[PDB]
């Protein structure tokens, strides 16, 4: 705190495909959130507690391209819509929120920090609504407490006419459950 | 091509800060007066002047990006100095906040027109003056952000 974010592209569409297929990736890794792509779509992956998490509906059951070729998921939980790999060498993990605050902040693939009010386990509302397209590709990004600790990962948007007004998310608790 | 939200600016006499919010580069009247801001196409005139609120604004220059006004209403604030130090500050009233750790006044010189950001790093106000006992700055006066939005209208 204050939570501020920036974004860096590290790869081109061409290099992404080649790397997808070979599974071998020698680029160096930094930061807590990774921007990641399959061939079909692109989304976010968040490192918490030494594991790199992201939405299952994005990754399916894929390996992640690493310096040593493809890496199998450590954890898979189709029902949480949740998936995990060992955090890439050089990333930094977030720690789970324990203040239990209800003022959340969602990090966006565009490196925006937008405030969210918690309204339940896995549901919170946006203080100012946004076009649903603004959020596409942010699935798997973190929600933070005012301290900058992980409260949850962004799963899905609650909307009508293409305007999102609330977000649905995987709470940090569910991660711990999925580890056990 | 990194862009800054906060510019470090200078007159012949003083040296202080400006902050881009919503396309406009604001700062303090007691620093700026009614001066123009320099550009490589020549001077650019103030877009807003509000002598009451110690508030002046030009069109945001090149190599700048704007902040968004804070909308979470949190009371936990962070002042940014002209040395890019961050100072935690607890919101009292509308324009008063108190340093969770008070410190030497020299530590905030050149910083009026700096921003105060919420947890989300969104803009809460511009910093105007220091509340202080001898030697030591203890709380801060700041132009709140709604003042900017309603100078804009």
């Amino acid at each position: 705190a204050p939570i501020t974010a920036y974004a860096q592209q590290t790869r081109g569409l061409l290099g992404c495909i080649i790397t997808s297929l070979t599974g071998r990736d020698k680029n160096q890794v930094e930061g807590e959130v990774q921007i990641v792509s399959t061939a079909t779509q692109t989304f976010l992956a968040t490192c918490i507690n030494g594991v790199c998490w992201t939405v299952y509906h994005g990754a399916g059951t894929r390996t992640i391209a690493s310096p040593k070729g493809p890496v199998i998921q450590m954890y898979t939980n189709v029902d949480q819509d949740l998936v995990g790999w060992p955090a890439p060498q050089g990333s930094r993990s977030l720690t789970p929120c324990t203040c239990g605050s209800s003022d959340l902040y969602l990090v966006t693939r565009h490196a925006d920090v937008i405030p969210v009010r918690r309204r339940g386990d896995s549901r919170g509302s946006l203080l100012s609504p946004r076009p649903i397209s603004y959020l596409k590709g942010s699935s798997g990004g973190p929600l933070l407490c005012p301290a900058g600790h992980a409260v949850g990962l962004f799963r899905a948007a609650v909307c009508t006419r293409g305007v999102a007004k609330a977000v649905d998310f995987i709470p940090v608790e569910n991660l711990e459950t999925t580890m056990r | 091509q990194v862009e800054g939200e906060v510019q470090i600016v200078s007159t012949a006499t003083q040296t202080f800060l400006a902050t881009c919010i919503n396309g406009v580069c604001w700062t303090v009247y007691h620093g700026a007066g009614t001066r123009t801001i320099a550009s490589p196409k020549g001077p650019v005139i103030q877009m807003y002047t509000n002598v009451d609120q110690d508030l002046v604004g030009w069109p945001a220059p090149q190599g700048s990006r704007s902040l968004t006004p804070c909308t979470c209403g949190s009371s936990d604030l962070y002042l940014v100095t002209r040395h890019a130090d961050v100072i935690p500050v607890r919101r009292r009233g509308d324009s008063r906040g108190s340093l969770l750790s008070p410190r030497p006044i020299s530590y905030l010189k050149g910083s009026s027109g700096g921003p105060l950001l919420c947890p989300a790093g969104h803009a809460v106000g511009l910093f105007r003056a220091a509340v202080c006992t001898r030697g030591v700055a203890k709380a801060v006066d700041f132009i709140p952000v709604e003042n900017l939005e309603t100078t804009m209208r």
Binding site: - | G4, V6, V9, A32, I37, V80, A84
Partner: peptide
């Protein structure tokens, strides 16, 4: 007189 720019500050700390 003209107000002049002597430096910038990026809040996210984004590098070159």
């Amino acid at each position: 007189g003209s107000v002049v720019i002597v430096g910038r500050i990026v809040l996210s700390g984004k590098p070159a």
